[PDB]
């Protein structure tokens, strides 16, 4: 699977470390393009980083800090487009991967494939084992029209570096080896030539091409300046509709495509909103509704009527810079059937800002969210009031799409709680992202949950630690109920089943439906039990009703 997604956790220490590595190994294991900030921080030394080994592109910045590994195998790293940049400057920054007072610490960049740095500068400081980082002609990397050609570099180490490779032309090298040799492609090139494969002219790369080539064509390119149109690094993916130049009726253009980040695709991928105007997003353009389309797609179409009112979460609109839910915003969410944005409950949710006479959130207030079905963002909990034994004010929460993810990576997080079981019964889709569930001392009925069906993509996985030991969990007796199919439940009893063994009577699982004996004869429908019409006489044993409405019964 080519495309993964960045993190966005900066230099901030990983909440659950014992998980953290296994977070990285999931995010990118299989990954080629990385729409956004490749962040590899805090990693200690016993740490096999063999999943990055596939990554070409990186749209974001590339942050490397406070690690300890002597080496990070980012060896195939073609181009880093600095779309967003670290500290709004550096499309790459390697910081303090030295030791917290022979030794550990990052030693060689080995970036022997990094041709282009489309935007932003470079910042490589305080890595007391790092060599040959000055020894790079950084000016060949930066794009031509890179007007962010700024660089700061530390050379101080406690270690004395070795000579480069003999097999290296200049003293220039990424690493001591001979394949680790800086291979230039802008300065050592022929004329106007942005990118080329040798001093010769014929060695020039295409203009649409962008990080060198193996030929004169766009279909010979090492990267793309605008969009990989199915192998032909272009300027513009063919739009969805063409014009007669004269009249101007535009019947659709069959061989048109969709700009996916840096790509040119026919069908915007899973969690992504295909558009009228031809993009893929996770926010529809203004004056658009997010429909649910004549297929299965999400889609972003217009608004005839001034569009109908819509709920917003944290990191969206007036709530954008808000971080937690408090008493002073909790009411906005009443009535909300689908929250655009995200909700998060930090421990300041539950003791308010006395600095601002903001009352602490009371556990009766949460009883707003039972009306909520679909979160388009993340869900993050770290305090939940001591009482409420379960996350069930979201009992009706059906899907979490995670087109925002907490700390970059996590669509559903749960830490330092004290609930005794989950309770999201209705939760079927975990659209994207990883679920992190750690340090809830009393948390059982996690194992009991079949995550593998919530999830939507292979890179996805539930990671968890420091919870309540799932062997001590049948130790007090806790386990799914008999009416919960395939052994799968979200908590005790047949409310928290995942699929009912036989039928549903509302929110409770049952063995069968009163077609024959129960206090009112019912009729079965989508394995739901529903009542017939009260005036359809009770039959002394046999079938009574035959449907919900007034007629289809007896008398």
């Amino acid at each position, epitope marked *: 699977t080519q495309v993964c997604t960045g993190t966005d956790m900066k*230099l*901030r220490l990983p*909440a659950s470390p014992e998980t953290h590595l296994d977070m990285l190994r999931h995010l990118y294991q299989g990954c080629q393009v990385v729409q956004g900030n490749l962040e590899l921080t805090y990693l200690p030394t016993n740490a096999s980083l063999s999943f990055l080994q596939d990554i070409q592109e990186v749209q974001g910045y590339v942050l490397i800090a406070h690690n300890q590994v002597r080496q990070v195998p980012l060896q195939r790293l073609r181009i880093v487009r600095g779309t967003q940049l670290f500290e709004d400057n550096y499309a790459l920054a390697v910081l303090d991967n030295g030791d917290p007072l022979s030794p550990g610490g990052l030693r060689e960049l080995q970036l022997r494939s990094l041709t282009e740095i489309l935007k932003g500068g470079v910042l490589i400081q305080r890595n007391p084992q790092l060599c040959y980082q000055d020894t790079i002609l950084w000016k060949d990397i930066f794009h031509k029209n890179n007007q962010l050609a700024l660089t700061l570099i530390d050379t101080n180490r406690s270690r004395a570096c070795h000579p480069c490779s003999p097999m290296c032309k200049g003293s220039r090298c990424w690493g001591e080896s001979s394949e680790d040799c800086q291979s230039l492609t802008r300065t050592v090139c022929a004329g106007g030539c942005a990118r080329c494969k040798g001093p010769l002219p014929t060695d020039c790369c295409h203009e649409q091409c962008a990080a060198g080539c193996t030929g004169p064509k766009h279909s010979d390119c090492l990267a793309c300046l605008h969009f990989n149109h199915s192998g032909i690094c272009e300027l513009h993916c063919p739009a969805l509709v063409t014009y007669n130049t004269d009249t101007f009726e535009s019947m659709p253009n069959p061989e048109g495509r969709y700009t996916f980040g840096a790509s040119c695709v026919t069908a915007c991928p899973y969690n992504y909103l295909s558009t009228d105007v031809g993009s893929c997003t996770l926010v529809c353009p203004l004056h658009n509704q997010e429909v649910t389309a004549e297929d299965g797609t999400q889609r972003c179409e217009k608004c005839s009527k001034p569009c109908a009112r819509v709920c917003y979460g944290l990191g969206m609109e007036h709530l954008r810079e808000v*971080r937690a839910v408090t008493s002073a915003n909790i009411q906005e969410f009443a009535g909300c059937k689908k929250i655009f944005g995200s909700l998060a409950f*930090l*421990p*300041e949710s*539950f*003791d308010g*800002d*006395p*600095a601002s*006479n903001t*009352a*602490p959130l009371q556990p009766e207030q949460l009883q707003v969210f039972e009306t909520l079905e679909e979160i388009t963002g993340y869900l993050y909990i*770290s*305090a939940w009031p*001591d009482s409420l034994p379960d996350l069930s004010v979201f009992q009706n929460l059906q899907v979490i799409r995670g087109r925002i993810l907490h700390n970059g990576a996590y669509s559903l997080t749960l830490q330092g709680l004290g609930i005794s079981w989950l309770g999201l019964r209705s939760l079927r889709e975990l659209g994207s992202g990883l679920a992190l569930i750690h340090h809830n001392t009393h948390l059982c009925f996690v194992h009991t949950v079949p995550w593998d069906q919530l999830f939507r993509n292979p890179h996805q996985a539930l990671l968890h630690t420091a919870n309540r030991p799932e062997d001590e969990c049948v130790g007090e007796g806790l386990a799914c109920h008999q009416l919960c199919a395939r052994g799968h439940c979200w908590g005790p009893g047949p409310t928290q089943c995942v699929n009912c063994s036989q039928f549903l009577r509302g929110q409770e699982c049952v063995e069968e439906c009163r077609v024959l004996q129960g206090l009112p004869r019912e009729y079965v429908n989508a394995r739901h039990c529903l009542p017939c019409h009260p005036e359809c006489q009770p039959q002394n044993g046999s079938v009574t009703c035959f449907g919900p409405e007034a007629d289809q019964c007896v008398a």
Partner: antibody
Amino acid sequence: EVQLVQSGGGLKVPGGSVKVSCKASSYTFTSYGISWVRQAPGQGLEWMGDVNTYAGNTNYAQKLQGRVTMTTDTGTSTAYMELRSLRSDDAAVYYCARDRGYYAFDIWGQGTMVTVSS
Amino acid sequence: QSVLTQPPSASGTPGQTVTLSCSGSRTNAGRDPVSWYQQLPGTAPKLLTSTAPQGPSGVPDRFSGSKSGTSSSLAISGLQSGDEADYYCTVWDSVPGASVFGSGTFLTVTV
């Protein structure tokens, strides 16, 4: 074990300053506040000010305004009691504390030794 | 917003059921701002009850506070041998909010 550790425990001449340290560990520093409180000998408690870890905002009490600056240090995780224009009155013990929950102050640095006399 | 502790000193022998007070100077929250502390001689004060009737973790069940109108009341089941300390409360309502002049108990081993 979550912790707060305090330093600066010294002596001072009236009309000087001190900036007490408070290195907080073993918990996401940014997602709780941090507060300071003082305790002269024989007497009792008295609250200094607030300090949302996440975003700086403050609430230095009345008896001390303009004489106090409190500062977070996210990068390194420390809170600082920058106290000014002190005197004999201002000789006390300056504890630092968070407020997990659910509302008061739970974890407590040992407090520091601050005495003024010329 | 403010309070007063009576007494600044109550004494106690083992097995006994104790009481300490605090008078909230306004209809505080609401309910649940108040919290009591334990102060060992020459060491850091630590929280005992908060939300009035709720122990934290690492503070024992012979501890349990309460409230009534604008007054709070800490309670000890049977007193023990380590409970030599001064006890403070707080109405953590608005800001700025106040502490108290301190109810401090001691272990009466034959006056």
